[PDB]
C-alpha cells in the first residue's frame, strides 16, 4: 500500500489529507519486527507528497531523517527511492554546514560495509553535497596538517605536536545531526573506497583526490544499479586479447587433511 | 579555524603585461642587447658568422653576440618565477630599440631559429602566436620608464658595487613596490648604460658573473623570498 | 685547488648530466643536431627529438660559470646517451657559441682527450661510481618526487660527504637513467624544470648552504 500510495492512491482522493495520520504513524513506526523497520522509508515518499501539496509539517524532520539512515538502508532494495527524496531534502538553502557534514560523515561511515551498488550511489551524492556546501570541503582535507618546505623549524615542531594530540571528534551515537561534531572530523573512510576491488567503483572514489571541476553529478545515472546489472555490463565486453595467466605454480589446489593455493580448505 | 577558499581548483596565474602596473613584479632589463639585421637576405649579425660584414659596418665584432641575449631569455623565461606569473622581461637593443617580452612566449632553444625571430621582430615590429590570439614580442616606445610599474625599485648589476644578498634585499623592500634589475648583456663594457634612470647599483657576487648566471641567481632569490617555489 | 676524480676526501658538488645526446657523424665527423641533421639522423634510425646537444651545452655553461665553480667546489661529469663518460675539468672555459662547442666536441670523442699547451676534457671509463667520492650522496631530479629545499637539504647532509645530482639533459624521457646508482630521487620545484635551470637552482642553494657567495 505504501509503495503505490504516492502515485496510485493519493491523486485519486478528494481530501488526501485524511492519510496524514496513517502516513505519520507509518513514518514513526518502531517495532520489534525487523521486517517492519523498512516501513518509515516507504512512508516518507507518501508523506512528502502531502507535505508538498497542502503546506503541512512534520516536527523535527531532519533529526528523524538522520536517524533513519542506518546500515539496513544501504542493503534494502528501496535505497534508490530513499536517495531520490534525500537529495530534495538536502538541496534546501537553509541547512547548516554541520547538519550536512553529519549526513556526509554518516553515509561515508556506512560505505565501509555497503555493496558496490550502494557505493555507486553514495559517492556522487557526497560529491554534490560538498559542491553545494564548500564549507564541508574541510572534511576532505585539513590544510593545517599539510607540511610546507619553507615552514620554519619551530613550525615543524608545532605541526608534530598537533599530529600527536589529534582525536577524531565524530560521535556515532548522537542523534542530533547538529551536535555530532562531524564538521571537525574527516572523511577518512572515503579514502579506503579508492582501493575498492572493482575498478569502476575505485575510479569514482578517486574523484575526491581530484579537482572539483564538475558542477554536479546526475544521480539518475548512478541510483538504480544492482549486482545483476554490473555483471551484465562486464559480460558484454568482448575478448580482444587473451587473459593473462599466472607464472607461479601450485601443487595442490586445496590443503590436505608442497604449495597450496587455498590453505584451510580440504576436499 | 580560518575557513577554506570556496574554489580550490588550480587557477592559472594571470599573464602580467605592461598595462598592469599595480601588481608586485620582478622586471629583468637586458640592457645593451646586440641585435642588428643586415641584407646579405636579412640575418641577425653575429660575432662569428658575420665578421667581414661587421668590419665593413665599422662595428667591433667583440660586441656582436646575440647569443648572450638569447641565453638570458632562456634562463629567465624558463625560471619558475616566470611560471608563477611574477616576472616580465624587457630588452634594450644597443641601437636604442626597446622590446617587450610577453611572459607566455617560448623562444626556440636553438640559436639559429632565435635569430630568425629577431629579424622577423625587428622588421615586422611584432610577433604573433601559433593560434593567433596574442602578440608575444612587441617593440615598444622608449623611454623604459613609462612601461614599468608606477612604484618600483631599480638596481643594476655592478661588479664594482658592494656585494649584497638578493634574498635579504628583496625581503627588506616593500610589497606594493616592484623590483627592476638591469642586466648588461654585453660581453664587456662600462656599467653606466642605465645610470641615468636607476637610483643605485648593487653587486651580486664577488667573483665576476655572466649575464645568464647573474639573472638566474637574482630571480632564484625572489622565488625564495616570495616563496614562489 | 682544482678538484679531480683522483681526490675523494674533499667535499664537493658533483653534477652528472645524464643521457647527453652527443654523437659524431660523417657523410667529415660533425656533431649531430636535431635540426641541422634531420635526414642524416633518419638514415641513422635515431629520433631527431633526442638529438639536441644544445641543452647539454647550456647546462655546462651555467654549471661552469656558477660562482661555486669559481670557488673550486664543483666538478662535472657527462654521461652520453651512447654510453660515453666525460670528465669536465673545472678550469675549462667552453665556447659561448654552440657552433664552436660542437667543433670541440667532435675533437674530444675522436681524440678521446683535449689538451692545452691537465686535460680540460677527458673521456673516462664507466661506471661513474668509481670516479665518484668514497663517501657521497646521490640524488636525481624527479618531477614526480616530493619537492625539497636545496638549501635545507645540503645543510642537513654531513660535511665530509659529497653530493651528486644526476641531471637529465634529455628533452623528454623517463627519469630512470641513474636509478641503478642513486639511492633516492628528490623534487626541486613543483613546476617542471629545464636541465639548465634545475642545475642552476641547485648550485645557487649550495652557494648559500656553504656560504660560497
Amino acid at each position: 500500500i505504501l509503495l503505490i500510495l504516492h502515485k496510485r492512491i493519493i491523486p485519486h482522493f478528494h481530501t488526501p489529507t485524511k492519510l496524514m495520520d496513517f502516513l505519520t504513524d507509518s513514518y514513526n513506526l518502531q517495532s520489534s519486527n525487523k521486517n517492519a523497520g523498512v516501513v518509515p522509508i516507504l512512508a516518507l515518499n507518501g508523506l512528502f507528497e502531502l507535505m508538498k501539496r497542502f503546506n503541512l509539517e512534520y516536527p523535527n524532520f531532519y533529526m528523524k531523517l538522520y536517524q533513519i539512515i542506518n546500515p539496513d538502508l544501504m542493503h534494502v532494495k528501496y535505497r534508490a527511492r530513499f536517495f531520490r527524496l534525500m537529495d530534495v531534502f538536502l538541496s534546501s538553502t537553509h541547512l547548516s554546514a554541520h547538519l550536512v557534514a553529519s549526513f556526509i560523515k554518516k553515509l561515508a561511515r556506512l560505505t565501509l560495509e555497503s555493496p558496490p551498488s550502494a557505493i555507486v550511489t553514495v559517492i556522487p551524492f557526497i560529491y554534490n553535497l560538498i559542491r553545494k556546501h564548500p564549507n564541508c570541503m574541510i572534511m576532505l582535507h585539513n590544510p593545517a596538517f599539510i607540511s610546507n618546505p619553507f615552514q620554519t623549524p619551530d613550525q615543524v615542531a608545532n605541526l608534530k605536536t598537533l599530529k600527536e594530540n589529534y582525536v577524531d571528534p565524530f560521535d556515532v551515537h548522537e542523534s542530533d545531526p547538529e551536535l555530532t561534531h562531524a564538521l571537525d572530523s574527516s572523511l577518512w573512510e572515503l579514502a579506503s573506497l579508492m582501493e575498492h576491488y572493482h575498478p569502476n567503483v575505485a575510479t569514482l572514489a578517486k574523484i575526491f583526490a581530484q579537482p572539483f571541476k564538475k558542477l554536479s553529478y546526475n544521480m539518475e545515472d548512478f541510483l538504480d544499479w544492482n549486482y545483476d546489472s554490473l555483471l551484465n555490463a562486464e559480460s558484454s565486453r568482448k575478448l580482444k586479447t587473451l587473459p593473462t595467466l599466472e607464472f607461479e605454480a601450485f601443487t595442490n589446489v586445496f590443503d590436505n587433511e608442497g604449495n597450496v593455493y587455498l590453505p584451510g580448505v580440504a576436499w | 579555524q580560518k575557513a577554506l577558499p570556496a574554489s580550490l581548483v588550480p587557477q592559472a596565474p594571470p599573464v602580467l603585461t605592461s598595462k598592469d602596473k599595480i601588481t608586485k613584479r620582478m622586471i629583468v632589463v637586458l640592457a645593451m642587447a646586440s641585435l642588428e639585421t643586415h641584407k646579405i637576405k636579412y640575418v641577425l649579425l653575429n660575432c662569428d658568422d658575420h665578421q667581414g660584414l661587421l668590419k665593413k659596418m665599422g662595428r667591433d665584432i667583440s660586441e656582436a653576440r646575440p647569443d648572450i641575449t638569447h641565453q638570458c631569455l632562456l634562463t629567465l623565461l624558463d625560471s619558475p618565477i616566470n611560471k608563477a606569473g611574477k616576472l616580465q622581461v624587457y630588452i634594450q637593443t644597443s641601437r636604442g630599440i626597446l622590446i617587450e617580452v610577453n611572459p607566455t612566449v617560448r623562444i626556440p632553444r636553438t640559436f639559429k631559429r632565435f635569430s630568425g625571430l629577431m629579424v622577423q621582430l625587428l622588421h615586422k615590429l611584432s610577433i604573433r602566436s601559433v593560434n593567433s590570439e596574442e602578440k608575444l614580442l612587441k617593440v615598444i616606445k622608449n623611454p623604459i620608464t613609462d612601461h614599468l610599474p608606477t612604484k618600483c625599485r631599480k638596481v643594476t648589476l655592478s661588479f664594482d658595487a658592494p656585494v649584497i644578498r638578493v634574498q635579504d634585499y628583496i625581503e627588506k623592500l616593500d610589497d606594493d613596490e616592484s623590483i627592476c634589475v638591469f642586466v648588461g648583456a654585453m660581453a664587456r663594457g662600462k656599467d653606466n648604460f642605465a645610470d641615468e634612470y636607476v637610483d643605485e647599483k648593487v653587486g651580486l657576487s664577488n667573483y665576476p658573473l655572466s649575464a645568464s648566471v647573474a639573472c638566474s641567481k637574482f630571480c632564484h632569490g625572489a622565488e625564495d623570498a616570495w616563496n614562489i617555489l | 685547488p682544482v678538484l679531480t676524480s683522483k681526490d675523494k676526501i674533499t667535499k664537493r658538488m658533483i653534477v652528472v648530466l645524464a643521457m647527453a645526446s652527443l654523437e659524431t657523424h660523417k657523410i667529415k665527423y660533425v656533431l649531430l643536431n636535431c635540426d641541422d641533421h634531420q635526414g642524416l639522423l633518419k638514415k641513422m634510425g635515431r629520433d631527431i627529438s633526442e638529438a639536441r646537444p644544445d641543452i647539454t651545452h647550456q647546462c655546462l655553461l651555467t654549471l661552469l660559470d656558477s660562482p661555486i665553480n669559481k670557488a673550486g667546489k664543483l666538478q662535472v661529469y657527462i654521461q652520453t646517451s651512447r654510453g660515453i663518460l666525460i670528465e669536465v675539468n673545472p678550469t675549462v672555459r667552453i665556447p659561448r657559441t654552440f657552433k664552436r662547442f660542437s667543433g670541440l666536441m667532435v675533437q674530444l670523442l675522436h681524440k678521446l682527450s683535449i689538451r692545452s699547451v691537465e686535460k680540460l676534457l677527458k673521456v673516462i671509463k664507466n661506471p661513474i661510481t668509481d670516479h665518484l667520492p668514497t663517501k657521497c650522496r646521490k640524488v636525481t631530479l624527479s618531477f614526480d618526487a616530493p619537492v625539497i629545499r636545496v638549501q635545507d637539504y645540503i645543510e642537513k647532509l654531513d660535511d665530509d660527504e659529497s653530493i651528486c645530482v644526476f641531471v637529465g639533459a634529455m628533452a623528454r624521457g623517463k627519469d630512470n637513467f641513474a636509478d641503478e646508482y642513486v639511492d633516492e630521487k628528490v623534487g626541486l620545484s613543483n613546476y617542471p624544470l629545464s636541465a639548465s635551470v634545475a642545475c642552476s637552482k641547485f648550485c645557487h642553494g649550495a652557494e648559500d648552504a656553504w656560504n660560497i657567495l
Partner: peptide, 27 residues
C-alpha cells in the same frame, strides 16, 4: 550513461602546453 564511461573520463582526466626543454614545432 554507463559507469564505465565516467571512469574513462576520470582516468583520462589524470592523463590530461610546452614543458621542460620541449622546443617549438618544426616546419
Amino acid at each position: 550513461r554507463t559507469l564505465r564511461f565516467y571512469t574513462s573520463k576520470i582516468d583520462q582526466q589524470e592523463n590530461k602546453r610546452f614543458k621542460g626543454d620541449d622546443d617549438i614545432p618544426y616546419k
